[PDB]
Amino acid sequence: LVHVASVEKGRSYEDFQKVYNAIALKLREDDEYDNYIGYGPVLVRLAWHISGTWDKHDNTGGSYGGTYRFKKEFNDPSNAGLQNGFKFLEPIHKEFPWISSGDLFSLGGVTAVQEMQGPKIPWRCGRVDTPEDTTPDNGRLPDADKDAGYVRTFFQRLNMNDREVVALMGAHALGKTHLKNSGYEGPWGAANNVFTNEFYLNLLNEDWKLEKNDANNEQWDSKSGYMMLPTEYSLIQDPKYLSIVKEYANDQDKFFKDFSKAFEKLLENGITFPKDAPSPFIFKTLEEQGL
Numbered sequence: 240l241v242h243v244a245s246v247e248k249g250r251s252y253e254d255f256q257k258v259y260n261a262i263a264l265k266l267r268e269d270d271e272y273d274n275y276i277g278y279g280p281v282l283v284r285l286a287w288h289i290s291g292t293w294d295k296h297d298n299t300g301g302s303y304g305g306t307y308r309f310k311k312e313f314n315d316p317s318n319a320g321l322q323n324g325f326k327f328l329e330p331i332h333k334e335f336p337w338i339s340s341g342d343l344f345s346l347g348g349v350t351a352v353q354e355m356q357g358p359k360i361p362w363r364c365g366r367v368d369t370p371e372d373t374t375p376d377n378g379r380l381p382d383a384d385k386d387a388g389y390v391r392t393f394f395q396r397l398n399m400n401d402r403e404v405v406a407l408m409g410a411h412a413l414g415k416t417h418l419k420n421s422g423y424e425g426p427w428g429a430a431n432n433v434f435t436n437e438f439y440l441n442l443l444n445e446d447w448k449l450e451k452n453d454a455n456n457e458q459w460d461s462k463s464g465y466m467m468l469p470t471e472y473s474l475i476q477d478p479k480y481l482s483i484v485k486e487y488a489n490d491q492d493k494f495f496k497d498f499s500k501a502f503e504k505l506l507e508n509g510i511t512f513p514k515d516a517p518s519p520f521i522f523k524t525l526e527e528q529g530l
């Protein structure tokens with residue numbers, strides 16, 4: 240399977256920057272969502288879930304095809320709650336009918352992170368919508384009740400090494416778990432719609448106690464009201480992962496620079512970019528544009 244990036248016909252930087260501005264202006268406007276967290280966290284979860292289905296072995300899944308638009312992947316139990324991010328983006332797709340689905344889902348992720356004061360993520364356009372039958376089967380996304388052994392082996396399918404996995408995990412500073420979506424409940428931290436290295440500082444500094452929650456699942460709860468899932472808690476139980484968590488807890492710039500590289504790799508896995516294709520676009524934020 241080869242997927243070659245085809246730029247939407249006749250579109251260039253300024254067109255894509257208008258879709259970004261539209262997503263960003265609507266993030267501003269709909270600030271009421273989810274107890275005033277806003278839609279930025281469910282949008283980076285949506286760009287990681289449409290990208291996270293990739294298998295490096297046979298090049299299936301990944302962001303290219305925009306197959307979340309189809310019922311099999313839209314209704315994946317692992318994707319519960321993402322319907323909210325989908326419904327956010329739909330008025331934007333109506334407004335800009337020429338952009339492909341995987342391009343819109345992924346750019347929404349880039350927009351959320353840069354507008355939540357995170358790092359600039361380079362983005363590339365060219366994902367082409369493929370048919371209902373290239374849609375991956377359910378079960379390719381990760382379990383929350385597992386250990387660092389599972390984490391390493393799972394992320395190897397998307398060929399992410401230790402550092403990329405820890406950098407990617409820090410997007411959990413954002414938003415929260417919701418009992419009805421995943422059987423887990425609670426924020427990871429206090430500033431959950433601002434992108435910082437808070438996740439690592441909490442993982443290291445709180446007095447976490449293992450408790451069962453109202454859905455009968457274990458989770459690590461802290462005195463401050465925070466929570467950690469069994470899978471990401473084991474990132475302090477693995478000697479290699481823990482040295483990286485401490486690195487990011489101590490250095491936010493490093494975390495942002497690494498996060499930017501890993502999230503872009505995540506969003507481009509499975510896609511071949513021809514030599515003539517446009518370079519990665521670095522989109523301006525509303526603020527930078529005075530808007």
Ligand code: HEM
Pocket residue numbers: 280281283284287319320381382383390407408410411413414415416417418419420421422423468470502
């Ligand atoms: C082993 C890996 C991962 C597991 C087990 C996992 C699991 C989960 C679960 C159970 C939720 C809560 C869903 C809900 O109840 O609404 C969640 C939320 C979230 N995840 Fe992850 N996740 C993983 C990796 C990632 C990565 C790599 C990213 C992004 C690069 C990410 C970004 C998010 C964000 C921002 C939220 C908050 C969403 C919201 O507030 O609605 N996750 N994750």
